[PDB]
């Protein structure tokens, strides 16, 4: 049976300032990558992520308090989002989950290595079905999908309950041939089969159309570098690691160039490798 995750995306003031008129397309681009991941057969389930609503916070007073404390930021967002959800899933703009995006560096008690936060197994509880994501560039799509995995009751793959079953999406800190681990396939199947994904059964009405082009088609290497290292950053000056400018000084978060990023005439990056656009 087909599951549909009806989603509201929310961008805080920091994102509105940074992205300007490009914001909505950026969020939708991020989300399109996540949706493709949930369509991978390795998840052993049918799950379509769809957007039913986007809110942009131009005035900080109209949003939740966003802070460097990720758990508090999550709690704040989760309370705030409740007023924006119609009670009935018959309403076209009713959503099963809500994601907040911010430029703010999120932190745990430990460090600020944290890039997102969510609660486990909450997807059909309107009061708790929430994720918060630090936008450090297009790699935020992978953070988005990781946190939604938690929302679907998937643990980290290094956990003890994954030992017999199990690199992958739920790794404690990516294999595009098999993005989801056996444990993740198991844990989401169980969650759904135990009846807890019941809000996900209904089709969306007039969903907000996701971009079908690869993310690198919209955003070149220089743009990718800007998203991660600020607007003064550019591509350093292939495909496997995106190096950006910061004596010539260059830096990297160690992620591949986005899929569809041009790496020459007639060629683009697919899975960290420069290849001909016209496949043989
Ligand atoms: Mg509203
Ligand atoms: Mg890929
Ligand atoms: Na952080
Ligand atoms: Na950081
Ligand atoms: Ni704006
Ligand atoms: Ni667009
Ligand atoms: Ni404040
Ligand atoms: Ni594996
Ligand atoms: Ni629904
Ligand atoms: Ni500027
Ligand atoms: Ni500048
Ligand atoms: Ni270049
Ligand atoms: Ni490093
Ligand atoms: Zn995690």
Swiss-Prot record:
Secreted as UniProt keyword: yes
Main location: secreted
Disulfide bonds listed in the record: 78-130, 107-112, 124-199, 162-183, 225-244, 236-250, 239-269, 263-274
Gene Ontology terms describing biological process: extracellular matrix organization; heart trabecula formation; integrin-mediated signaling pathway; kidney development; negative regulation of angiogenesis; negative regulation of cell population proliferation; ovulation from ovarian follicle; positive regulation of G1/S transition of mitotic cell cycle
Known glycosylation sites: 276
Binding site for Ca(2+) 2: 6, 89, 202
Residue span(s) of domain Peptidase M12B: 3-204
Keywords noted in UniProt: Calcium, Cleavage on pair of basic residues, Disulfide bond, Extracellular matrix, Glycoprotein, Heparin-binding, Hydrolase, Metal-binding, Metalloprotease, Protease, Repeat, Secreted, Signal, Zinc, Zymogen
Superkingdom field: Eukaryota
Protease found in the keyword field: yes
Binding site for Zn(2+): 146, 150, 156
Annotated Ca(2+) 1 binding sites: 6, 89, 96, 199, 202
Post-translational modification: The precursor is cleaved by a furin endopeptidase. Glycosylated. Can be O-fucosylated by POFUT2 on a serine or a threonine residue found within the consensus sequence C1-X(2)-(S/T)-C2-G of the TSP type-1 repeat domains where C1 and C2 are the first and second cysteine residue of the repeat, respectively. Fucosylated repeats can then be further glycosylated by the addition of a beta-1,3-glucose residue by the glucosyltransferase, B3GALTL. Fucosylation mediates the efficient secretion of ADAMTS family members.
Cellular localisation: Secreted, Extracellular space, Extracellular matrix
Entry annotation: catalytic residues: 147
Domain Disintegrin: 213-277
A GO CC annotation given for this chain: cytoplasmic vesicle
GO molecular function: heparin binding; metalloendopeptidase activity; metallopeptidase activity; zinc ion binding
Domain notes: The spacer domain and the TSP type-1 domains are important for a tight interaction with the extracellular matrix. The conserved cysteine present in the cysteine-switch motif binds the catalytic zinc ion, thus inhibiting the enzyme. The dissociation of the cysteine from the zinc ion upon the activation-peptide release activates the enzyme.
Main function: Metalloprotease which cleaves aggrecan, a cartilage proteoglycan, at the '1938-Glu-|-Leu-1939' site (within the chondroitin sulfate attachment domain), and may be involved in its turnover. Also cleaves COMP. Has angiogenic inhibitor activity. May play a critical role in follicular rupture.
Protein name per Swiss-Prot or TrEMBL: A disintegrin and metalloproteinase with thrombospondin motifs 1
Native source species: Homo sapiens
Gene name in the database record: ADAMTS1
Full-sequence range covered: 256 to 548 of 967
């Amino acid at each position: 049976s087909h599951r549909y995750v009806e989603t509201m995306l929310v961008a805080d003031q920091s994102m509105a300032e940074f992205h300007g008129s490009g914001l909505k397309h950026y969020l939708l681009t991020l989300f399109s990558v996540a949706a493709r991941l949930y369509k991978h057969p390795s998840i052993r389930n049918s799950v379509s992520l769809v957007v039913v609503k986007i809110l942009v916070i131009h005035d900080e007073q109209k949003g939740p308090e966003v802070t460097s404390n990720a758990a508090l930021t999550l709690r704040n967002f989760c309370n705030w989002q409740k007023q924006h959800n119609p009670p009935s899933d018959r309403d076209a703009e009713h959503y099963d989950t809500a994601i907040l995006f911010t430029r703010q560096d999120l932190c745990g008690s430990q460090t600020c290595d944290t890039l997102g936060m969510a609660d486990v197994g909450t997807v059909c509880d309107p009061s708790r079905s929430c994720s918060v994501i630090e936008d450090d560039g297009l790699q935020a799509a992978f953070t988005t999908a990781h946190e939604l995995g938690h929302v679907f009751n998937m643990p980290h793959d290094d956990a003890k309950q994954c030992a017999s079953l199990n690199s992958h999406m739920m790794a404690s800190m990516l294999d595009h041939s098999q993005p989801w681990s056996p444990c993740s396939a198991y844990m989401i199947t169980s969650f759904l089969d135990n009846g807890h994904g019941e809000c996900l059964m209904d089709k969306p009405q007039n969903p907000i159309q996701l971009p079908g082009d690869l993310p690198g088609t919209s955003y070149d290497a220089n743009r990718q570098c800007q998203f991660t290292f600020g607007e003064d950053s550019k591509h350093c000056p292939t495909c496997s690691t995106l190096w950006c400018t910061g004596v010539l000084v260059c830096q990297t978060k160690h992620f591949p160039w986005a899929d569809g990023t041009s790496c020459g005439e007639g060629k683009w990056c697919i899975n960290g490798k420069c290849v001909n656009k016209l496949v043989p």
